[PDB]
Amino acid sequence: MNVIDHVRDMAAAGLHSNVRLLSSLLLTLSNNNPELFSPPQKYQLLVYHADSLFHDKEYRNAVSKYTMALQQKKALCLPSEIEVKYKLAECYTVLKQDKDAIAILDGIPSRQRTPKINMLLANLYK
């Protein structure tokens, strides 16, 4: 297996605390040793970390990581872009930035929107 695999596992088992401190350290290490991780791996790392930040309820931090993740995604069973946007939207909502929550969701092609994503939108339109 692999270090990031282990972070995804720990993520699964819900050791959020651990994922946070480790992914954080991993990220620090990544900015100092580029190509210790592959671009797909970096995306994974960012999502796991942001998810972590999110569960810990530090939304502004999560927001920046999420948007960083999406940037990475632009470059070319990984976390779905659509899953990330959803949580991003959630962060914005709690932060009372609905303009921004709406934007990210609305930017998802209508045919690609999930029931969950449509609920959120619906609520936002109020």
Added chain:
Amino acid sequence: NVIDHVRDMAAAGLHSNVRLLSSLLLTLSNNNPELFSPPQKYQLLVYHADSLFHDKEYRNAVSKYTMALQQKKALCLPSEIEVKYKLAECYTVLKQDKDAIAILDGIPSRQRTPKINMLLANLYK
């Protein structure tokens, strides 16, 4: 930070927990010999060995414990005397009496706690 966190989980008694983490941290440290302070490396090792000890992997604990002491010689931190104790506990369970005795005997008498004196006494029968 990180090392501090592992400490807290250990204290909390969340052992099967710290094993996974400390393990991954150890392998990382090894690959980035400059990622962690010598003092922090020591902590890691000790904490990992303890988890290896809660899970009952004594031979493996012995290894980590001895690497710990081996490191603490290059030099907050867990008592070197407490490590030596746990180390002797492993040898004992493993029935390596000679090795248990040696490590305890090697502690200056002035510094030997009741626990240690008892283990020794037991081992001397």
